[PDB]
Write a protein that binds this ligand. Structure first.
Ligand SMILES: [Ca+2]
Lengths: 132, 130
């Protein structure tokens, strides 16, 4: 099972507000190590959102359960919101042996993958021209 | 008293390696709030370096002592290193009630300032155009 969501980002939300909304979607109010790790990579994740990395390549969460693909909308699409889908997820999106794959322009992968590795082994980045 | 340093960044160093080299310069390997707070903002600082924010507007450190301005070189300048200056500083660059001002593109100031605020009240971002 795979489900998708689409969040309104800049200029409706700034890049950090966008990540915070994604963290809430994926952690659902649970104060645990998963939420702590997602919050720990905020600088990197917001940087990638500000570069519109998730416009055409999703943030992908994997778990003991359905996969979640998260896209972001920018510019007029974010202002309009017609393509947005921010519904609550009908499952625990980071259950069990979870992971997250962040899209990243290939030229930034060097610094991004190192920056992520400081905080997590479950949150990784990929070249946004490829899937997981 | 103001002193300046200029570091070779991408492609000689990636943006994170560049921040780490700056942290080494300003902390001189010593532990404390300074090294800890500088390392805590690595994701934001590296993002700014990757966007060449310190090319024309310096990273500025203040302390009980001289102010340090740090510029970054990119692309051809970083490859040849002609204008580089990475010499150890002759003073404790983050002694006492230290602070750091990071240059930031105006379009990203909103998220960057919120991201830094999570980690530190001593490290702030400014609009690099000003
Ligand atoms: Ca960028």
């Amino acid at each position: 099972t795979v489900v998708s969501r689409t969040f309104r980002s800049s200029p409706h939300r700034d890049a950090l507000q966008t990540w915070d909304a994604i963290v809430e979607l994926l952690t659902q109010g649970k104060d645990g190590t998963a939420r702590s790790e997602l919050r720990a990579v905020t600088g990197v994740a917001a940087s990638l959102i500000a570069d519109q990395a998730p416009k055409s390549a999703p943030i992908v969460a994997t778990c003991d359960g359905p996969r979640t693909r998260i896209y972001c909308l920018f510019d007029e699409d974010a202002i309009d919101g017609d393509d947005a889908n921010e519904e609550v997820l009908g499952f625990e999106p980071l259950k069990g042996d979870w992971g997250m794959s962040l899209p990243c322009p290939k030229e930034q992968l060097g610094w991004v993958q190192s920056a992520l590795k400081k905080h997590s082994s479950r949150i990784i980045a990929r070249d946004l021209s490829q899937g997981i």
